[PDB]
Write a protein that binds this ligand. Sequence first.
Ligand SMILES: Cc1cc2c(cc1C)N([C@@](N)(CCc1ccccc1)c1ccccc1)[C@@H]1C(=O)NC(=O)N=C1N2C[C@H](O)[C@H](O)[C@H](O)COP(=O)(O)OP(=O)(O)OC[C@H]1O[C@@H](n2cnc3c(N)ncnc32)[C@H](O)[C@@H]1O
Lengths: 133, 666
Amino acid sequence: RKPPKGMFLSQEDVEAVSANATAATTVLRQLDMELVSVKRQIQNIKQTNSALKEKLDGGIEPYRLPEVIQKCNARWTTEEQLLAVQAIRKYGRDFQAISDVIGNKSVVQVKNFFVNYRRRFNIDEVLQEWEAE
Amino acid sequence: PSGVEGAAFQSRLPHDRMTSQEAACFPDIISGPQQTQKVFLFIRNRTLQLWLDNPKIQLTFEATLQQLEAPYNSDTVLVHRVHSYLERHGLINFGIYKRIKPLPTKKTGKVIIIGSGVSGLAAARQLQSFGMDVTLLEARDRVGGRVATFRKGNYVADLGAMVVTGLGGNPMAVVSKQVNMELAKIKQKCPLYEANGQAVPKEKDEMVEQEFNRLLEATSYLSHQLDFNVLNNKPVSLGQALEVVIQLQEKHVKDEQIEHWKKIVKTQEELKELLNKMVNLKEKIKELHQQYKEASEVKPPRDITAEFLVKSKHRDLTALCKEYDELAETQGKLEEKLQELEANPPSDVYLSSRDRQILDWHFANLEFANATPLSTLSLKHWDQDDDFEFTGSHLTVRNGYSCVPVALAEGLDIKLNTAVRQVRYTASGCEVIAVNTRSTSQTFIYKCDAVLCTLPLGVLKQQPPAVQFVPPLPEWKTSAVQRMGFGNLNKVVLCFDRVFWDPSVNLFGHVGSTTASRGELFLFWNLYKAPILLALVAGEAAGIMENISDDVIVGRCLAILKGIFGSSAVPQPKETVVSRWRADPWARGSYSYVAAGSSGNDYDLMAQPITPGPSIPGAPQPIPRLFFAGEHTIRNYPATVHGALLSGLREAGRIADQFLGAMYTL
Ligand SMILES: Cc1cc2c(cc1C)N([C@@](N)(CCc1ccccc1)c1ccccc1)[C@@H]1C(=O)NC(=O)N=C1N2C[C@H](O)[C@H](O)[C@H](O)COP(=O)(O)OP(=O)(O)OC[C@H]1O[C@@H](n2cnc3c(N)ncnc32)[C@H](O)[C@@H]1O
């Protein structure tokens, strides 16, 4: 039914290692080369990745900005409203980024704002100019 | 098995079914009713049992019916038809038994038997047992043929046959009861010892062997399941097949390695793409921080657009830091996944040179078992006789196997030193022309009704022929002689003055340095009470070693032994013998094997007797005149003493039927 275990033989393989006198050592050489061909190319990319790793030395620790835990607020200060309008011009619909910029507005308060001052801050125009980028 | 059915088994017969030969002699019964068949079967089995239970005295028809019961002992013609058939075909009253009623007053028919090997002797006894005129013609100065026993002083060692390969249904089981035969078991535990002269660790010893057995099974799969049997018109040998399997195993090892390193490069090259992404991020992260820094330097109070810039860049920065953190997360996973794959590679090699050498010893051992290079054995058929193997321990004849042919030879017309040179057979009878081996010009002529030829295959193989057939043997028979393989394997008998080896071990191996030399002195037998070691030359080596003087051989022998037991533990052997079977004129080899391009069927062709053409044209179809027994004629037990024995019994039967007619088919 099936060859013993730890023993591998397919009809296809048999015909390949018999086609001529040395088809045997021909096929076993192609793999011998093919292995070295890959084995070398492993070290080649091990070298590449080794160098790229040393560029990334120091992590990004000289660039990390401390935590700003500030409580989400109900009120829209004129300042906060202006930050908003500008953030829209820069971020479009990304309510998450816009919420992050203002700092004390929930991702939904932002969406509310979008509808509340919709006409007064021509958010129509403001949004279509963001699209023009 | 035991009881009545045990006897049937012990006689190589299905206890609950009529054989083809029974169907021939009892065409009524087998085509008859199931009830009848079963009565018959019991009778047969019972009679066999009786003979078996006590095989040192003849079992007569009267003595038989005596022990039968109702309903069985009612029909005494069936009981007679049975006891006769069994006696005819040597299933009962064969070998060395005591005759109740001394031989028939006068002899009927005359038979010349060529060679007094076991097949010869067995057949002779039977023919004379049936009251025929029998003379055997032996070229040698002794009986036995390929049953040679060296004897000098107290040293006794078989240069020929030496093992009884299981008593389970072995006709030799019977014989060994009839003759005083000291039979000793053989502990099949065999420690190996490399070229350096040190044991092979139980670790490897097993890992190699198991791999061996696997490789064999593989050839068998390759043969039956894939039908890999004809390559470039030539029949595939076991050798080629074993090579192909090994290569394909070596291939797999590489296929594995290739796709595993291929696994690594894909991951390594994934890690690369990620680092590139990471560098190009730390790049913007650097510059973006600068910009936020510059925007923070603009000291307040600042208008809103300049305040937005600070807030903006802040967001943007933490956003890009979010990514880099996650990409450093990914990095750590892919970076360990690479130590994962570099922790467990697939196997380095299929087999080392140390492995491949021990594997060769197993191959040599198999070459020893077939007395031939595995490159000659038929892939499909080499083992066809596997199923007929006897049950029980293999045994050694302690007092020398020769005691058997010698015991058979007692009371037989045997012309020793008589070399059959020509066999002429015609419609009216045969004459056999032999010469005296000593003074060769002294010529003998033998006239007979029938010639039974137990000439070794290697002999029937000779070219130019050692024996002429007049008229020539029909091409169908000669082809079968060409096709069949006749191998070789030699022994070195080393007789010392003391047991310097492990007495609890029967056999130990030595591992050769090459494939080419794998069978050279590859195995040693300690069997006897006496300090005798027996060393085997098998495979390709066997044929080559015959061209090497005994001293040189015994040299290589002591060498190996010293190398294993200590350079000062191994004395000089008091007596040595070296067999040369291929060289021997009356063997031209050791025993047969199924060569590639042959089959079990050829063995049948060997047994088929020869019927001469008619004398006067248009006269009736002649009787068969020329008959063949011998180890090479018995499909189901080739290359063995019992096989020979049985072939002899077989031919005797057939000849008796031919010339004494069938009294037992009415
Ligand atoms: C050679 C050899 C053979 C056997 C063994 C060793 C060697 C060395 N060992 C073993 N092989 C078994 C191998 C083995 C053992 C365990 C597992 C697997 C395999 C063996 C070898 C080494 C160690 C132990 C045993 C065995 C053994 O242990 N057990 C066994 O049962 N058979 C073993 N065999 C095979 C059997 O020995 C053989 O099948 C059997 O004996 C053959 O009986 P034939 O068919 O009757 O042929 P014939 O030649 O005896 O008689 C014919 C006569 O004709 C004359 N004649 C010729 N020309 C002329 C002429 N012109 N004019 C006139 N005359 C002429 C000749 O001179 C001769 O007298």
